Structure 1
Amino acid sequence: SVITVGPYLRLHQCGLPKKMALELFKPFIYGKLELRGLATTIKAAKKMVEREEAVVWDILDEVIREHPVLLNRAPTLHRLGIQAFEPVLIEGKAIQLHPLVCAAYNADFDGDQMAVHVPLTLEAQLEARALMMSTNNILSPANGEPIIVPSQDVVLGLYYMTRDCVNAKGEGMVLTGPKEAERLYRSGLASLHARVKVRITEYEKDANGELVAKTSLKDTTVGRAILWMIVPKGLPYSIVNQALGKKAISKMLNTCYRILGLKPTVIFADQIMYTGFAYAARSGASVGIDDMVIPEKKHEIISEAEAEVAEIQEQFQSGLVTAGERYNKVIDIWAAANDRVSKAMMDNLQTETVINRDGQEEKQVSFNSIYMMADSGARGSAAQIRQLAGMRGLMAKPDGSIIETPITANFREGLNVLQYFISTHGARKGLADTALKTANSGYLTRRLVDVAQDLVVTEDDCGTHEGIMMTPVIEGGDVKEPLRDRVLGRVTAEDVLKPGTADILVPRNTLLHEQWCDLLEENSVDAVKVRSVVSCDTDFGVCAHCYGRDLARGHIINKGEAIGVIAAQSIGEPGTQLTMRTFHIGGAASRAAAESSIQVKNK
């Protein structure tokens, strides 16, 4: 059936359309009917569910109770693409899917359709509870980092709740508990502000298996306080005190999972979802053409650039700067013009909105709608704003070139017949990439699967001392991947040494986790020897100390998992979004820098 949103309905549940079950569950129903004694014979049962009156709906509820169903969508790319839920019957023709899982499924609500399947037996039901229910797996068994992460209006609401603002009545009150709900709901106050000092208990995990209460009065805001009612003990207050954007919230469920485990985090998520929606809705967040603010400077920069390029083309009329070099030249002009118009609009939409306590300008971060939307991390990006307010920029000709005259218009002012017709080139060229990308992607995953399936994970330990030496990835333009991110999880081949001679921080082989990675982070160790698969721990299996973290649940991988296929779908799942082929990614000029002179960022 078609998917709609689930905006109550906790994570492990799933709105299943009333009419549609009653079919799926037929055999089950007839069983119950014959037990209660409402039908002596199969034809009787059959007839009453055909007539579908009365007792039958009552028994349907009794049938469905705790019986996990499983939903599946479309291209199934990774194993997350099918998950299992407790249904809740709902009159309707469509299936309600909780928001949080929309990530995994890669599903919006524009007319996507889900299949539903019914586990029978017992074994299957248990495999659905203890494997595919959406509350087992909150972490992506590729990168390891959480999925489930709140998106889109949840983000916008948390980000609105926690802000600072100048003035906004009831500022500098001192209150305790807070609870502070009192005061937002009652008026009395504005949650964006006041920079209210509130007293708070912490409950740190400082002591092993015990929560030590620490309380104090902190300077914070009302909506911070309000939001603190959700956070389940064991975490610091400092996690909720900040602008709290998208990133922030992934990190916050990450820390929660790591510190206090699965059970309180899967609830904690829910709660976050709810308070997000809530508040975001209260905020009244909207969008209006005045929300797109074109900087006054734009006209001036474009005129200056029209004059420069005029100078160079007149030099071409004089014989100088042949069109060969003049092309790259004019590209270098209009692109710098792009960057300057961009910088102007970004400077204008951030900051400003200057409120006044006695000094008339404290110069606060803007509360502009589109700005908040990009800033929150909810929708969109700076680049995407620049299309609405500053220049569109240089257009890519379908042959992989750049047109000399870029589009000077944002979408707030419209495009010209000519410029729109030019935009078209690249639009369609890019639509037609997603086709190709599906086919080639899938063929790739097909082959990867095919090769990798026999891998199993059989023996527990192997005992091989071979391994791979692990370092940072440093290159020009500092380092992209830090050595903790590479060496996390895994396991250690031979030992590690402190920067001092004959000093070991880890024995033998060890599982390396967030704590051990903090040990290695605080010391000067720039290389760590780590054992891994492909060093052929054991025979057929790839034993678990190679390998060594399952991702997903953060413990080490248990014996008997696949690994094969997980890898293949982990590799292959991405690449749906990829540059594909035939791009030079030049950006500036075809001619190389030609400077062999090195440079350093730091000392």
Structure 2
Amino acid sequence: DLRPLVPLDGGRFATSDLNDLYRRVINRNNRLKRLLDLAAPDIIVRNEKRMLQEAVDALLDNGRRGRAITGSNKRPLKSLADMIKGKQGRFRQNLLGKRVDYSGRSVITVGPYLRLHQCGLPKKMALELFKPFIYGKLELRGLATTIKAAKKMVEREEAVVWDILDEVIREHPVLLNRAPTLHRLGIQAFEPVLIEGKAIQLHPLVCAAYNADFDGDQMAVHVPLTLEAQLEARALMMSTNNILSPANGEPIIVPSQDVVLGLYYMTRDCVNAKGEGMVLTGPKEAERLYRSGLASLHARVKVRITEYEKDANGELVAKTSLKDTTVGRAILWMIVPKGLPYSIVNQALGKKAISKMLNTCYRILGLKPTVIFADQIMYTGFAYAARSGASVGIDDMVIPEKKHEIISEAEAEVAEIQEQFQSGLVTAGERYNKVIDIWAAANDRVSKAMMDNLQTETVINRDGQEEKQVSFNSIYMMADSGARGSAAQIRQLAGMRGLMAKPDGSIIETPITANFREGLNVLQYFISTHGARKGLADTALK
């Protein structure tokens, strides 16, 4: 039963490799027995003994000595050693890992309404995954008197089995896992919420731990069965338990992208905004003004703020004072718990500021206020990123007006050094280094001009004067908040792309002086393909 015969259509009872090797051994042994019985000449029995030795060697380990014997299709037969060892052997294929029951998988979508401890499970999957629990619950309340009655009820998918399922999945964690599991945060426990459809909804804040994005990723779900497994899922593997990185102790619930963009947008000030300069009783009046269209989210106002600080014994004492802030900061202040100072929100909140706020909350207050704060932060960031209406257009990539003159001057310097080389004053390698340095300096100048032009805008004062404030350009807002993009990518978007390297590594002396707003020509694109494919191949092969 460990070496079965394969039955296929048409009655072909084909044999496996082990049966073939055993048959060869038995045939040789029987022939040798008969020859030894009949007193054959030694010249024949020696050959038979050698063939028997080779047959036994092939059975035990095919290919170790001499040439491996092959089957019908020129492939060597599998021996006992091949079954024992290797990546396809018993240890690594069936003992160190195995396929399991009560498991499923499907594509993951995003659920922005979920709490940190919740997942979105399709009810078609949950009906299959929790079938014995549903049978037990159906029999327990008299709906089914036998097991076949419950089986038929579940097969027909009656209206009451859905209530039974919602009863049985109430507080029962499930383990979500995404491959590859590089660390222990690749498996986490969640409480299911039954949803319509075929995709799994995943909380955004846990996407960084899984290293997952919503463009085709699939996730597997497993169901703990025993009480010990359920309590281990709740007490050890639950997402609300895993907020610090075991590698270095850093947080792993860092908000990103839309949340960061929304929180950064709401906590900013404009020089002359609607509703500026009025005095408010508190954050609630600020929100009431904002929802009525009477004040701007960036207007600079005075707000009466009450903040609590923990005493020496550990009691929260309240101090109330008038603060110079904005409408959006006062509105955001209604989300913070009571143990934190107001200075933690009275600024433009980038990625680092939000992470600092979460870390301060965790250090001062604890775990439960921190998870509630994280959920509220995500909700508010999503809401105000939606309200902002942030978009991307072609006019956002502003090219500096002085780029052409810089390029022309660099070209003139390169022509001068080339003429000097042709005059015999300088050598070849030093001229190459000089050209490279000239182009590097030109690229640095172009980048500085682009960033200087991009990061500031002109605004009209209350009196009618002109002030310079931080730019509200969408690309600059995305890069400055840390939501997406870096300085190098913005430079490639609006300034020259710079010097490129050959696949061996040598820098091509002439650079790509075009950005992506005004596209490259054929030669520049072909030059960039070298580094593109080098990086892609390294990523694929490491």
Cα offset, 1:25, TM superposition: 0.4
Cα offset, 1:3, TM superposition: 0.6
Query: What's the counterpart of residue 207 of structure 2?
Result: 102
Q: Distance in 2 between matches of 1:186 and 1:108?
A: 34
Kept in 1, the 8 Å contact 2:262–2:384? The answer is yes
Secondary structure of residue in 2 paired with 1:362: strand
Kept in 1, the 8 Å contact 2:351–2:481? The answer is yes
Cα offset, 1:47, TM superposition: 1.1
Consecutive unaligned residues in structure 1, runs of 5 or more:
437-602
Cα offset, 1:339, TM superposition: 0.6
Consecutive unaligned residues in structure 2, runs of 5 or more:
1-105
Kept in 2, the 8 Å contact 1:7–1:99? The answer is yes
Q: Report the number of matched residues.
A: 437
Query: What are the Cα deviations for residues 58-93 of structure 1, in whole angstroms up to 9, with x where unaligned?
Result: 100001001010100011111111110000000110
Cα offset, 1:359, TM superposition: 4.8
Q: Distance in 2 between matches of 1:307 and 1:293?
A: 25
Kept in 1, the 8 Å contact 2:275–2:296? The answer is no
Kept in 1, the 8 Å contact 2:268–2:298? The answer is yes
Q: Distance in 1 between matches of 2:141 and 2:273?
A: 64
Query: What's the counterpart of residue 254 of structure 1?
Result: 359
Kept in 2, the 8 Å contact 1:230–1:272? The answer is yes
Query: What are the Cα deviations for residues 541-561 of structure 1, in whole angstroms up to 9, with x where unaligned?
Result: xxxxxxxxxxxxxxxxxxxxx
Cα offset, 1:358, TM superposition: 2.0
Secondary structure of residue in 2 paired with 1:423: helix
Q: Distance in 1 between matches of 2:350 and 2:495?
A: 25
Cα offset, 1:356, TM superposition: 2.6
Kept in 2, the 8 Å contact 1:138–1:148? The answer is yes
Kept in 2, the 8 Å contact 1:351–1:364? The answer is yes
Kept in 2, the 8 Å contact 1:180–1:225? The answer is no
Kept in 1, the 8 Å contact 2:283–2:334? The answer is no
Q: Distance in 2 between matches of 1:247 and 1:170?
A: 30
Q: Distance in 1 between matches of 2:295 and 2:250?
A: 35
Cα offset, 1:127, TM superposition: 0.5
Cα offset, 1:15, TM superposition: 0.4
Q: Distance in 2 between matches of 1:244 and 1:56?
A: 49
Q: Distance in 2 between matches of 1:121 and 1:186?
A: 51
Q: Distance in 1 between matches of 2:422 and 2:294?
A: 68
Kept in 1, the 8 Å contact 2:274–2:296? The answer is no
Residue 210 and residue 343 in structure 1: after superposition, are their counterparts in 2 closer, same or farther (change >3 A)? Answer: same
Kept in 2, the 8 Å contact 1:119–1:125? The answer is yes
Kept in 2, the 8 Å contact 1:180–1:222? The answer is no
Residue 284 and residue 317 in structure 1: after superposition, are their counterparts in 2 closer, same or farther (change >3 A)? Answer: same
Query: What are the Cα deviations for residues 103-142 of structure 1, in whole angstroms up to 9, with x where unaligned?
Result: 1011110100000010110100000111111111111112
Q: Distance in 1 between matches of 2:194 and 2:155?
A: 19
Q: Which is further off, 316-325 or 64-73? A: 316-325
2:510 aligned to which of 405, 417, 423? 405
Cα offset, 1:354, TM superposition: 2.6
Kept in 1, the 8 Å contact 2:421–2:427? The answer is yes
Q: Distance in 2 between matches of 1:255 and 1:212?
A: 18
1:57 aligned to which of 138, 162, 169? 162
Q: Which is further off, 226-235 or 140-149? A: 140-149
Q: Distance in 2 between matches of 1:361 and 1:385?
A: 28
Kept in 2, the 8 Å contact 1:145–1:254? The answer is no
Kept in 2, the 8 Å contact 1:199–1:218? The answer is yes
Cα offset, 1:320, TM superposition: 2.0
Q: Distance in 2 between matches of 1:190 and 1:408?
A: 45
Cα offset, 1:193, TM superposition: 2.5
Q: Distance in 1 between matches of 2:288 and 2:468?
A: 27
Cα offset, 1:145, TM superposition: 1.6
Q: Distance in 2 between matches of 1:247 and 1:122?
A: 41
Kept in 1, the 8 Å contact 2:458–2:466? The answer is no
Secondary structure of residue in 1 paired with 2:300: coil
Cα offset, 1:43, TM superposition: 1.2
Secondary structure of residue in 2 paired with 1:182: helix
Kept in 1, the 8 Å contact 2:121–2:193? The answer is yes
Matched, 1:305 2:416: no
Q: Distance in 2 between matches of 1:33 and 1:377?
A: 53
Query: What are the Cα deviations for residues 298-351 of structure 1, in whole angstroms up to 9, with x where unaligned?
Result: 101010000001111111111122111111111101111111100011001101
Q: Distance in 1 between matches of 2:276 and 2:296?
A: 10
Query: What are the Cα deviations for residues 419-440 of structure 1, in whole angstroms up to 9, with x where unaligned?
Result: 001111110111011122xxxx
Q: Distance in 1 between matches of 2:296 and 2:214?
A: 32
Kept in 2, the 8 Å contact 1:170–1:188? The answer is no
Residue 315 and residue 283 in structure 1: after superposition, are their counterparts in 2 closer, same or farther (change >3 A)? Answer: same
Secondary structure of residue in 2 paired with 1:314: helix
Q: Distance in 2 between matches of 1:12 and 1:210?
A: 30
Q: Which is further off, 91-100 or 344-353? A: 344-353
Cα offset, 1:200, TM superposition: 0.6
Kept in 1, the 8 Å contact 2:282–2:304? The answer is yes
Kept in 2, the 8 Å contact 1:173–1:194? The answer is no
Query: What's the counterpart of residue 11 of structure 2?
Result: none
Q: Distance in 2 between matches of 1:355 and 1:308?
A: 42
Q: Distance in 1 between matches of 2:295 and 2:440?
A: 44
Q: Distance in 1 between matches of 2:295 and 2:179?
A: 45
Kept in 2, the 8 Å contact 1:68–1:119? The answer is yes
Cα offset, 1:184, TM superposition: 4.0
1:232 aligned to which of 337, 340, 348? 337
1:2 aligned to which of 91, 99, 107? 107
Cα offset, 1:192, TM superposition: 3.6
Cα offset, 1:361, TM superposition: 1.7
Q: Distance in 1 between matches of 2:360 and 2:513?
A: 45
Kept in 2, the 8 Å contact 1:391–1:409? The answer is yes
2:447 aligned to which of 342, 352, 361? 342
Residue 84 and residue 105 in structure 1: after superposition, are their counterparts in 2 closer, same or farther (change >3 A)? Answer: same
Kept in 1, the 8 Å contact 2:283–2:333? The answer is no
Question: Which one has a bigger Cα radius of gyration?
Answer: 2
Q: Which is further off, 37-46 or 111-120? A: 37-46
Q: Distance in 2 between matches of 1:116 and 1:239?
A: 39
Cα offset, 1:188, TM superposition: 4.6
Cα offset, 1:164, TM superposition: 1.0
Kept in 2, the 8 Å contact 1:5–1:99? The answer is yes
Matched, 1:244 2:349: yes
Secondary structure of residue in 1 paired with 2:224: coil
Cα offset, 1:178, TM superposition: 2.6
Secondary structure of residue in 2 paired with 1:213: strand
Cα offset, 1:189, TM superposition: 3.7
Kept in 1, the 8 Å contact 2:276–2:300? The answer is yes
Cα offset, 1:231, TM superposition: 0.2
Secondary structure of residue in 2 paired with 1:144: coil
Residue 355 and residue 105 in structure 1: after superposition, are their counterparts in 2 closer, same or farther (change >3 A)? Answer: farther
Q: Distance in 1 between matches of 2:357 and 2:287?
A: 26
Kept in 1, the 8 Å contact 2:280–2:286? The answer is no
RMSD of aligned C-alpha atoms?
A: 2.4
Q: Distance in 1 between matches of 2:526 and 2:343?
A: 52
Query: What's the counterpart of residue 443 of structure 1?
Result: none
Query: What are the Cα deviations for residues 171-192 of structure 1, in whole angstroms up to 9, with x where unaligned?
Result: 1110112313444444454444
Q: Distance in 2 between matches of 1:21 and 1:181?
A: 45
The structure with higher relative contact order (CA 8 Å, sep 6+) is 1
Kept in 1, the 8 Å contact 2:112–2:204? The answer is yes
Kept in 2, the 8 Å contact 1:161–1:191? The answer is no
The runs of 4+ residues in structure 1 deviating greater than 6 Å are none
Secondary structure of residue in 2 paired with 1:387: helix
Matched, 1:276 2:381: yes
Query: What are the Cα deviations for residues 484-530 of structure 1, in whole angstroms up to 9, with x where unaligned?
Result: xxxxxxxxxxxxxxxxxxxxxxxxxxxxxxxxxxxxxxxxxxxxxxx
Q: Distance in 2 between matches of 1:199 and 1:236?
A: 14
2:499 aligned to which of 389, 394, 404? 394
Q: Distance in 1 between matches of 2:252 and 2:294?
A: 36
Query: What are the Cα deviations for residues 468-499 of structure 1, in whole angstroms up to 9, with x where unaligned?
Result: xxxxxxxxxxxxxxxxxxxxxxxxxxxxxxxx
Q: Distance in 2 between matches of 1:184 and 1:274?
A: 21
Q: Distance in 1 between matches of 2:463 and 2:502?
A: 55
Residue 187 and residue 262 in structure 1: after superposition, are their counterparts in 2 closer, same or farther (change >3 A)? Answer: same
Q: Which is further off, 348-357 or 78-87? A: 348-357
Kept in 2, the 8 Å contact 1:168–1:193? The answer is yes
Q: Which is further off, 57-66 or 206-215? A: 206-215
Kept in 2, the 8 Å contact 1:174–1:197? The answer is yes
Cα offset, 1:204, TM superposition: 0.6
2:425 aligned to which of 303, 311, 320? 320
2:311 aligned to which of 201, 206, 210? 206
Q: Distance in 1 between matches of 2:468 and 2:295?
A: 19
Cα offset, 1:292, TM superposition: 0.5
